[PDB]
A paper describes a structure:
P2 is a small 15-kDa protein with a β barrel structure covered by an α-helical lid. P2 belongs to the family of FABPs, and in all crystal structures of human P2, there is a fatty acid inside the β barrel. An important feature of P2 is to bind lipid membranes and to stack them into multilayered systems. Recently, three point mutations in the [name] gene, coding for the [name], were linked to autosomal dominant CMT1.
Residue numbers in the entry: 0 to 132
Write the structure that this text describes.
Amino acid sequence: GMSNKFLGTWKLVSSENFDDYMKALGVGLATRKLGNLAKPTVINSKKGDIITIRTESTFKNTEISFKLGQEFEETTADNRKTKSIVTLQRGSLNQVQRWDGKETTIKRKLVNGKMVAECKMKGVVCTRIYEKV
Ligand SMILES: CCCCCC/C=C\CCCCCCCCCC(=O)O
């Protein structure tokens, strides 16, 4: 199952290519400007088989709760209404979001104690690195 090392509170320390990733998602300029300035805290928790990923920032907060492999309805930070599924693949927690015939993937994995999120949309790849606590 998912490693308990995922669980806890994480702080963004690095973000690479987020602007072009947001452009690929259709996010407008003013929103992208604030999105690029955000340094969110991500809190991963688990209760039973239900996993929760909560994101907190001054600009926007989000929260998703899910069981592995079961599709759920998600509202994203940029207010897309997606159908999403999270799977586990070689220690990588992989989230796929589908809406309006499009899809994007967010793959979260642990690397030397950091959480690395790789966000992909239409060949555009963004990497965000988080530190524990
Ligand atoms: C907290 C989310 C980012 C900052 C606030 C929202 C800013 C722009 C909305 C554009 C969509 C953001 C997609 C979220 C990708 C998060 C990937 C990650 O967890 O590192």
